[PDB]
């Protein structure tokens with residue numbers, strides 16, 4: 001009554017690993033210990049071997065991320081049984097190199113990091129994950145105390161960039177030699193090699209994904225390749241360094257008053273903005289169930305390094321089946337999560353009468369437009385345009401002078417508060433796979449709410465398009481009137497406004513959601529942003545803004561020209577000073 005249950009305990013483990021079979025993992029790694037002289041053998045023996053297979057497979061493209069992390073789960077849970085035996089014993093094994101991984105300062109994005117985390121322990125490296133919002137201080141300090149071979153920083157929103165760069169200067173100033181590895185949503189070949197590398201005398205590499213992380217972490221710890229690599233990269237980052245400062249025959253940059261002059265043209269006297277049916281701050285609620293439908297799974301599969309869009313990915317050739325299998329496992333966890341009610345999304349919406357003044361929107365107390373309670377600020381494209389507007393989000397709102405009644409809204413949500421709680425649980429039982437799952441869904445769940453609310457606002461709450469029945473697949477294409485710009489995106493790069501949002505809706509109170517040093521959000525699975533109704537409104541990016549606007553924004557916000565240059569760094573069309 002079994003099958004593989006009659007093999008040598010060593011082939012048994014080696015197989016249970018690849019397949020990712022954890023139901024015998026305890027008594028299997030055990031028995032193999034009794035038949036082994038010293039604890040550490042079952043590790044460098046069956047297990048370690050089980051992993052090279054995965055790795056072999058992963059390479060020909062037979063296996064995938066979903067399973068890999070899944071095999072690790074076994075791999076870990078085994079070493080997690082020999083803790084007391086391996087410890088109280090001889091030598092206790094070794095690795096290819098120990099690494100300090102961490103989500104930089106003020107940032108709370110960590111999914112891509114765990115993956116890299118796990119993908120590396122899967123090639124036998126020791127990974128010390130400090131977590132998120134970690135001081136450039138605690139990163140290197142630990143780099144020191146645990147004698148790491150290389151520091152890895154992870155970033156997600158714009159503000160983090162200045163953190164990494166603050167970390168390199170620190171690595172330059174603190175005389176560090178090891179290699180700096182930088183990654184995350186925001187990092188790029190270019191950004192690393194323009195503003196980061198040239199601050200760290202040591203090797204400073206940028207990698208695009210956990211797969212390629214291994215190739216670099218290899219070369220960077222190779223008695224051979226190291227010298228031959230760091231050097232190929234230094235000279236590579238130079239090439240791109242000089243191609244980005246060629247100041248290509250670029251469209252000359254216009255003056256802040258010119259652009260502003262060339263504003264979004266529209267006859268407002270003739271147009272009457274849709275009265276927002278429901279004025280006021282409201283706390284909405286939706287169960288996972290409700291949300292499930294609105295989930296755009298694509299990003300999900302991109303989270304799990306499975307390329308392609310859904311549902312086309314399911315019928316894919318090389319990866320399709322797994323995509324199917326991965327896709328199931330999730331839904332499965334979702335079912336559980338929706339029933340027991342252990343991960344509940346929350347959210348808060350709101351609609352306030354507004355109007356346009358300069359490049360900002362004025363939010364009004366009551367229908368009277370007598371008292372200003374909050375001012376949403378927006379930047380304005382500052383390149384030379386002809387025939388087209390110099391788009392500035394505020395334009396899509398009936399100015400003050402037109403005395404026309406226009407409106408604006410905002411929201412914030414989250415796939416659940418218990419996100420972190422549930423995540424840690426899996427860390428506990430060493431379930432990397434499920435740790436990364438619960439998070440990847442919360443997101444989907446979060447991102448999901450945003451779509452739902454928006455639709456409901458579009459339908460009910462604001463009520464300008466009550467007879468709307470687009471499909472989920474259509475909602476994914478933005479086939480509706482109006483947008484929902486959110487702080488950070490190119491349409492409105494200034495992250496601090498998320499504060500204002502928190503203010504209007506008093507997020508903290510209705511959802512518990514919070515904001516951090518770098519105006520990121522907690523839980524990680526969160527989405528906040530603005531609601532615009534005017535039909536012409538589009539997600540048009542800011543791009544580069546000159547010195548004049550930064551100043552004028554300075555005042556507006558009531559900040560220092562410098563404090564603004566920080567938060568806006570990406571979009572500075574002039575010399576970053």
Ligand code: B12
Nearest residue numbers: 112152158183185209210486488489520521524526527528
């Ligand atoms: C799922 C996602 C989210 C999630 C959450 C992730 C989290 N916080 O835990 C949700 C939907 C909730 C979210 C929220 C936000 N987001 Co978002 N999001 C995405 C999306 C669809 C997918 C990328 C993704 O997350 N991949 C999986 C992960 C985390 O992988 P990854 O970062 O790519 O990691 C891979 C490698 O980069 C690597 N890497 C990672 N770390 C390291 C470390 C080292 C050391 C090395 C060598 C390599 C490495 O590991 C991975 C592969 O093996 C992107 C897509 C895109 N299309 O570019 C935007 C995007 C990242 N988001 C963006 C922004 C604007 C925001 C918010 C401010 C929005 C809001 N609501 O107002 C907030 C973030 C604040 C917060 N959460 O506190 C921007 C960033 C632009 C900016 N602001 O500067 C992007 C690029 C959108 C665009 N086109 O501009 N987001």
